[PDB]
Amino acid sequence: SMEQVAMELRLTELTRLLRSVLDQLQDKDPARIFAQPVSLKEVPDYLDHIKHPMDFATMRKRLEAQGYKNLHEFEEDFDLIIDNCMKYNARDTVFYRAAVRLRDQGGVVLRQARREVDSIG
Numbered sequence: 001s002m003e004q005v006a007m008e009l010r011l012t013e014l015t016r017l018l019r020s021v022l023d024q025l026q027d028k029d030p031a032r033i034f035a036q037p038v039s040l041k042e043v044p045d046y047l048d049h050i051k052h053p054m055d056f057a058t059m060r061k062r063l064e065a066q067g068y069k070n071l072h073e074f075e076e077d078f079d080l081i082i083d084n085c086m087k088y089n090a091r092d093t094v095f096y097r098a099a100v101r102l103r104d105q106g107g108v109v110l111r112q113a114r115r116e117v118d119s120i121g
Helices: 002-027 056-064 071-088 094-120
Strands: none
Touching: 002 056, 002 071, 002 094, 056 071, 071 094
């Protein structure tokens, strides 16, 4: 149908806008602390602590499969990256501090993305 295609064009544009957002959020992590999944070889107990791991490369795979239906789902995953880190790592660690800075700096990007998603529809 013509509707399904129009629907698909919107998802492709949402995917387009979320890819730009992801790139901007990932620039806020120049140390690449959140780039890849926490290694289960190097942190074998990780899943005893963190039930839903997340990282930027895993978000990118979902993104490129057009697996985010709306900005809310995308934000859920970004928030997991941050909140998982802040639980597993103590306050006085480079990891916890990197998450705080990513949260704070990502807020600005995400604030405008919401306006752009509502605005463009």
